[PDB]
Amino acid sequence: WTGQESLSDSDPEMWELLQREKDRQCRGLELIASENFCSRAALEALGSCLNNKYSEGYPGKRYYGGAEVVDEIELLCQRRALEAFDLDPAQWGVNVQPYSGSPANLAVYTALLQPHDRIMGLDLPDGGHLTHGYMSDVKRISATSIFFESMPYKLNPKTGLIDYNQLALTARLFRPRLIIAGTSAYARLIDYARMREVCDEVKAHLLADMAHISGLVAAKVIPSPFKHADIVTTTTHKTLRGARSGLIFYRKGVKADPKEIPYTFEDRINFAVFPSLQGGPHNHAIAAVAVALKQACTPMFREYSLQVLKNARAMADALLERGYSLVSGGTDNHLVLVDLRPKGLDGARAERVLELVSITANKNTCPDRAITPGGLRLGAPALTSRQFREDDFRRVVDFIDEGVNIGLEVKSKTAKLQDFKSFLLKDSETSQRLANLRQRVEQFARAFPMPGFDEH
Template structure:
């Protein structure tokens, strides 16, 4: 009897202790959930302020960087951060995405409107986190492993994701998983050598040609790129990430008239959040030898 009573009292004491611990833990968690970062993590807060001072006092000359707006920062720190939304609007792998679907559809509509595109002729994916994942998504949608690509060489003003490699090493995923033959600028004029590009394309027979730049100061001749791509049965991708704001403002030629796919970012000259966008053509691509229309199937790879 006495032993049973002792065991009962002991178990009650243990339960009470566990309950107190749980309450204390919940209290600490609730406190952390409602603390400002300068209280919860002073060390990180100092680093944030150090970076803010650096940005305010320095003159940033990196073309791919910009200062975004307060409204964008407010969206980035909103409750949207908490939601998973894998899949596409109306076809998600998670529940509770009815609001996220509306947000994504709004972003798609605004992306098309920014470049005066018809939704009947162009589709758009706004899910990439930046330009590099956007380009890789295009490659994996249009190409098979070891298919051939041609992009402007990095030392000549191209980008890492356009198939860059050195004589001893393949640098980016685009040169590791696909066969890359970069084109170059004319060393005398500093301009893209379109004649040499056309000559090499006839020999190399790429499946994808990339009209894109990171530090090339001239406008691109998209019509010439289109002619070379058509001659070799290649897709034409324009990576306009560094000049997308100028295209939207109609200051420089638009790639949309000639390209099959256009990739860009939203955080450079568009001054938005850090993200990427992929535009892809819909409808008829060409006419086959038997006179039957050949349709774009890029949307099916989305």
């Protein structure tokens, strides 16, 4: 044994699964708003020998030896992170050790708040993420709602946009210590200036979770939350097109003067990441993130982010011009909140019909009330990374419309949901129409190239 044998030679069962998943991504229309195809450069660093190094601590303040190289890799990733978002190192610092977005947010709350302190985030059916403090009326869901006290703010159901007024009213009553200005299913731009006004009045922290729009902010394509927020959290995949990781941007320097009150975020943020919450940093992921952060400063990323908008706007217009209404009307970022209620089909079996035909999306709750949500959430960054353009996404919408029409035609002879999915696999007529649409769907997708490796 050497440990240098190939995966195909040593573990062929796993290697086959790699090729199947690689073929599924190549043959399919990936429309999940949070997915993206990582570049081979970053994947080579993700599966590197950096996995072998225990480097707990921070550059200069580490606990082991032999960390001289990972210190430079972490510092480079920190430096590349600040300039992908045009930040002054004297005003902003970044932590690159969060394992993902969920751990990154939990580190922010642990750093700045005591247990049971109050947070306010956008509710989950209203577009906010789990880690913004989601608890239903029956059960505490996210640990952000267990270890901290959470009251959600909602959208205006007539407007489809964030009810900034109701937020401000409930904010002085609830008195949160931190408000999260970040979304997972929201097509408009967040008024960070209005968020900072609410935060300055109730004397809370303004955390911006830019996970979904991190690439659009890096490319100076949409307005940046760094102008108003004290702490910014992000995933490194999604629009940043990197490995699965997380980052925590914090403000450093002087804050305010009663007679130079400094910012006290850095030491708390860093201590919450390690040793409070996480153990050993994943240096292979940190390097893959630095690779993608370098690609974010390049002019091709500005052209890439600009293309994701145009194709998200094209997908929005194409869906409107086929009858589909969209929550908030259209989009301003990378995703489209489609409303399938004015069509007679939910978001549940509509996803199952599209999934059966190599089109990946997810059900999304629209401004209704169970297992059959309102519409779906369609994303552009994934396919745009295969040089999809406006005309390409118009075929995507038409391919989706055919799936919806089959979905409306299976609710024909089915009752609930199990009746639906069983018919799509049982009756020979429905399966062939789905299979026929699959060959045409997979044929259109395979033609575009795929970032990353070739067979895995």
